[PDB]
Symmetry: D2
């Protein structure tokens, strides 16, 4: 296998191929005559990356790195993941999606069209990898903040899958980004000459649903019923409907619904680690009961149940207010330490400023947001580093645990225990600064722990299909955690005793 190795991003090491490797692979001459470690390659990529004057340019550099040398791509990511997550995934990935006609380099992923109904198995055969354990599929209809972007949203399952690997350690060769193109209702794309999608309105109803049914059937026929299928930015009602439809038939989840709710409940439990009270000692007023607070309320009721409180009064503790009409305030549209959750994305759609809370409540108010908020310079001297609830706290570790143990379905208990682990992740010195989530530089480790917990759950509820149940699940998950470290392409040469390998010259 010669020149084709330098064209495979999973194999190509660039100038990190040693001379022995280049000679054994038949690629000597195709690479410049220098031999680099991955550290030097990282430094060179970083120099080229810091010369860009845009997040779009940085994104293009990272995507070219991904399609050249993906071990180096994930070395770039897993080195300062907090820096590259905004560029590879939201927010920058949404803007790149907005500008994919202009900035269309090599295409990545699988584009499955409504007009391919009946032939999705062949389209799956078109993907080069055959051992696919995770599929992130998007509709393109509700790209975060940007609305309908159909067939430009392909950067979302790609970017998100990068976070599967960067934050979780999921093997990138076992990941399949899919965009289901059923048309778009975005009028600017129907007229855009650079638009790469179907230029008609979105198909919906008994053709959309049958396309999705055939997609799930084809994916689990080719890759097995254990294939994790995550649904990306679908429309809200459509997303919830598909979640309820496929949740128990397949190994699917929706990170926008279940991951967001899990992060919110994680923040609430981390705040309880400060209020020193039980979840039963809390009454919750929600502010955005528009399918977003529904997941938070359900998972919070489930946590109240698990700590002992039966369903009815656990539901009595929730006061969901939206446009018609205490201890914890959560918005997605009296007490010593009130819990205020902004949880709204664009930093302008929000409930507070992380300084409004901390300067109005006299600083004795535990704030959390889904929007980036700089530290506080409160007059008394309290600093109050405010924590941000990233969805990357949930889906990488959950996906790693589900892929590791072949978990067949992802019930809500998985997400509750994920929230519990994320709550336990926060250090008391971080809680001293009002920080409700672990730092992103720890996400790998955090993911690992979550995976183990998820594994520990799935075996004790007969959900894990991997056999036999590993006695030590930490080392089993660690054996599946993908690392950006290069493999050795040198050939394992050994010999036999010099009487078995004797060439007979009879």
């Amino acid at each position: 296998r010669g020149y084709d190795v330098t064209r495979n991003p999973h194999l190509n090491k660039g100038m990190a191929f040693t001379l022995e490797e280049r000679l054994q692979l038949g690629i000597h001459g195709l690479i410049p005559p220098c031999f680099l470690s991955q550290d030097v390659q990282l430094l060179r990529i970083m120099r080229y990356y810091e010369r860009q004057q845009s997040d779009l340019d940085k994104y293009i550099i990272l995507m070219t790195l991904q399609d050249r040398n993906e071990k180096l791509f994930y070395r770039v990511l897993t080195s300062d993941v907090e820096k590259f997550m905004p560029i590879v995934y939201t927010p920058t990935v949404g803007l790149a999606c907005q500008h994919y006609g202009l900035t269309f380099r090599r295409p990545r992923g699988l584009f499955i069209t409504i007009h391919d109904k009946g032939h999705l198995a062949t389209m799956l055969n078109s993907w080069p990898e055959d051992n696919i354990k995770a599929v992130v599929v998007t509709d393109g209809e509700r790209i975060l903040g940007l609305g309908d972007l159909g067939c430009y949203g392909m950067g979302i399952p790609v970017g998100k899958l990068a976070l599967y690997t960067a934050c979780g350690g999921v093997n990138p060769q076992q990941c399949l980004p899919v965009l289901l193109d059923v048309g778009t209702n975005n009028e600017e794309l129907l007229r855009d000459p650079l638009y790469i999608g179907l230029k008609h309105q979105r198909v919906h109803g008994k053709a959309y649903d049958d396309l999705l049914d055939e997609f799930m059937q084809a994916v689990t026929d080719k890759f097995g019923i254990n294939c994790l299928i995550q649904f990306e930015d679908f429309a809200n009602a459509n997303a919830f409907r598909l979640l309820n439809k496929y949740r128990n038939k397949y190994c699917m989840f929706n990170d926008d619904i279940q991951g967001t709710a899990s992060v919110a409940v994680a923040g609430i439990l981390a705040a309880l680690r400060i209020t020193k009270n039980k979840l039963s000692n809390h009454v919750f007023v929600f502010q955005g009961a528009g399918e977003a607070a529904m997941g938070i309320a359900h998972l919070l009721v489930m946590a109240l149940e698990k700590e002992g409180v039966p369903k009815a009064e656990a539901t009595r503790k929730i006061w969901m207010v939206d446009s018609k009409g205490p201890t914890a305030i959560i918005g997605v549209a009296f007490h010593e330490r009130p819990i205020i959750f902004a949880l709204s994305n664009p930093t302008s759609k929000a409930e507070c400023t992380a300084e409004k809370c901390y300067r109005v409540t006299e600083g004795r108010g535990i704030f959390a947001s889904g929007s980036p908020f700089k530290s506080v310079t409160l007059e008394d001297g309290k600093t109050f580093i405010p924590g941000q609830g990233n969805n990357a706290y949930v889906f990488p570790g959950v996906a790693l645990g589900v892929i590791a143990g072949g978990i067949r379905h992802i019930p809500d208990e998985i997400f509750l225990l994920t929230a519990e682990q994320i709550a336990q992740e926060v250090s008391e010195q971080h809680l001293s600064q009002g920080r409700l989530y672990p730092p992103l530089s720890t996400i790998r480790d955090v993911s690992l722990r979550i995976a183990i917990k998820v594994l520990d759950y799935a075996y004790k509820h007969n959900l894990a299909s991997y056999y036999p149940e590993p006695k030590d699940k930490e080392a089993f998950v660690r054996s599946l955690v993908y690392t950006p470290d290069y493999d050795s392409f040198t050939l394992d040469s050994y010999t036999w005793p010099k009487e078995a390998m004797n060439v007979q010259t009879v």
Copy 2:
């Protein structure tokens, strides 16, 4: 052949693959669900290309296009070749070479090192294409204007090979860019951490020469003695020595020596088309007799001989002046229409300003340069569009004629008749504006003509090895001219009479 087709730049058409082609190639799903002609792809590439604020960025866009979709790359080039020649080749390619550590995307070409002495055949085996008809090899030692750039000069044989295809129509799959890395004497690269080459001094003498001997031997052993081997920016003395060594042993030429001289003689003959006199009615004073004016003087003497004038007095007509000591003045360091040739590159190293000549000589002076010179606004009203002598007038057409007819060696007569054809290319209305060279937008056609002439010569002097000699050489060369038009990847399905293709069910 599925996903690998989208990774082969010679095959990949991107969204220009039709649905039938995508289904037949097993690549359906890998491409966005839109179907474009090459015109729409060109418009999209041009939109992305005009958004760049640098020639380096434009160069990077074009090189990414080349390694994605090379039919589209050559469609971009052959559309307004005058615009993209400065970016793909000199001057911009030299600056990119200066910045190849920073801007190192996918590597192209073959890097053959002095330490590979004895194993060059294996390195040639490393190149994916087996039918190589043109090899542009560089040392990296005398990159135009930039000096020693060793192992950064790989962009020079790549860029130049692009001009082989864009300007000449040479098949890009039959072209092999080679950089011979023997070390570098550039001290800034020996310390540069981004440097991709050997970090020692240049090897020279009986090891350099044996490396070059083995390189020529290996190239003609793998690709045949008819393989055209062009020597790129070697050191001046080294370049001339290698030219004289390999000129009659192989199908080699040096475009810096022979191409430059041919362009200069072409300009001189085009100027004679204005002075209305014979070449014998001219006495030539040279100004830069430093191996650069030597080729011009030799080829000019050869032209004087061919028009009738024997060698001795033809040499008597040349007055080469440099630092120790009429009708035509040529510099590379009385009469009605004096011929002034600047021929110096950086527009600052030169002999005139194309306005100094035209305002001092009262406009009755035929000027030519190797430097870009804007038009003149002379007070009387004479405009005087000054022509520029590009090396792309010579090497593409000569290479096309040599590859077409399997010409075994390229004598100086080839370059003289190339200069004669280029002189004949200029229109009388262009000569009315003082323009000595055809416009670059015509280069393809010009190359074709040159090829035919070269072919016509090689057959009548028993130099063309292609058999049988085509009766109509224009259509034979046209059958080999590569075009950026996409091929059809659909399968030629036919049937037999429905008694021969009957399936026997005995």
Copy 3:
């Protein structure tokens, strides 16, 4: 994929490729210009096959067919399987094994040597198929009747795997024949110059065992813990030891031990279908208690337990006699219908002649053998077609059920219910002739039923790992039954509405 298709036996159809298929596969011209159905190909193969004057020649023809066109090979087999089972498998395969140095055509299978200890994963990587669901491994040490044949015994896992497909419908591409060469103690092979194996004595003890441990580990690391690993002709004590070692750690079984016992118990239960009594109404005297009657006695005790009779007296019903010291007599070394089982292979090592029993017992004696016995011409007029207990009644259907449902381990209950199904297979008109086993021409169907039963068991005892449990297991097993029918290699071409597939010419 052109010429390589005609070299792949799983793909190559020979002259059964249609013209459309030949043109689409790029193989047109490589095949003679005739188009045959598989029926005509079968007739041609049969004509060539009936021209041979030896079972060795017939075997060579069938093995060449297997390595040319394996769909046609299995069409030949599954057509009159009773005729080709003696040639593909025992007895003829043993004689071919004896003569593999002389008759060494293309090698099939994987040869793993004791000197490969530590590198078995790479050797498994050497096998072209990656989806292996059944591995038949042999030591070569106890080839049936022939003794130690080490590294000539490779025809045994090959032949047996053929029966996996011919009799069971197991996919042949998911089958891997392995020979573990640890040397041989056969002195004639150590001196044989045609011998293809290690020419030293058998390795044994802590190196043999570690080689087997690494083999099981490597096979289940590459192909999954669900890979069925059948142990072939190992030495008796070695075979039983390995069975007990790996029985619960892996999905392994030994067909010589468990399959033989299952066939014997099947014959006993079929005979009970004639004696009209319960198994509790029988006392069993065995004659060959040398690890061969042990399995029969254990499985018979298990059947007595399952019908109601507790362990102690169920064991009291067994009288195993060998060299020191009624209703049923079984040998592997009073009542209305005595049951006499010869069960000994070479027709000379046996307990009766199938005529001795029927002429001495006055015909009222139910005889079964493991040796071929022609019908009886008893003086009264009773014909008494005597049945033969083939191991192919057990292992194909059990393997099909285990591969279908991903059964993790094969307990003895699987083999008991297999024996019960085989007993139920016999028709009452066949029991009227004293025939205790179904005819081999039914084996496919029989295998299917066994598979379903095995499946039905594994799900109700939480042994089947395939998910979800199919509601209709017959159609699920039928979907996995491999058939010799050719697939269509024509490409599924469809179109989009002629507005989505419109090529944009903007």
Copy 4:
């Protein structure tokens, strides 16, 4: 490249792969654990080969060897070529052709049908090798002795190509056997259910001719005008017509016409080496002037011309008698040493018995035949080993010289000088026994010499296209002579100085 190497007959060495080679090729485990030299493999093949009781069985063994391991196949052939020539080629190949429906193993060659008119380039693309330097094409219409065998005659270009390699040393990978199926007029094949060809009458006239024109055009378009195209057993008139048509347009010859004539003239000149006279001292009576003696007479006239005798009287020396009406008697239907040539094939169609000549002429008669004739036991004591004129004396060496030097056309002078070299090959002690041709065990050497002579001719008449003309043509031809010796598949690993190959860990 793993398992595919064992499936490529040009690469596969079987058990001759060393352990290092098996590990480097990723084929370890696919081969039995023994390591053989080609001598041991030859001995094993010979043991299996001498166990056959038919020339048809021996032929099948050799063809299976050819499609398994072609270096070993040509080692078998080039070892005792006199023994295996009758089996690989005529006479046995004709009988195998008669029995190709019964004995149809793996197909070899390219079947191009009349119904493929217009698509022969695609069919040539179907052949796996791209560097084809020799094409033996047959019609199947005049298979030697057997008549029309259409599409069974494919064994003739295969067998003959084997002799290209075995006797000449032509590279087998550069050889392409083609059968042009235009139907058959053999009535037994039109009804034969095993027949693999077109079951209609032969196409002829303006469709046959256009198919042949497109075949020659396609072969020289894909493989170059230097591709040697030999026409095999075409019909006599058709063969001569095609020879005259394509002789000067392509590098074609007909071995049945020109090779036979060259062998006959070689025998005549060798006999002159006994009669001690000049060719001008001979008058020739022919007996079979039916297009077979025409070539002999033309080449003999050419030899008379070359020795000095002008055309007219040189033709006066020929007396061609057939059914209407001295020194040399030649049949294809006074003096001290009369020359009697039987030259008729089936030993029953002939002019003498090689004993009739030697017992009637009193032993002083130089006999030659085309039929095998055992030695003579003449009463006086003279032994008279009679020589046989094989066509393998001509076509292998001529083909080697034509492929070596890229000779563009094969004029009759090539065949005359071939006859002269073959005449010179005979030793005087062999001439003492009345043997007119060199022994076949020398054919390789003989071929070499012929090649050199042919090369020496083609350069001095400007027929050789290979450049540059090698100063020593013996060593140039020897560098192209293919040998059955195995290549080494081990990888050439070298290192750089341990400062150039230092991995930078900046």
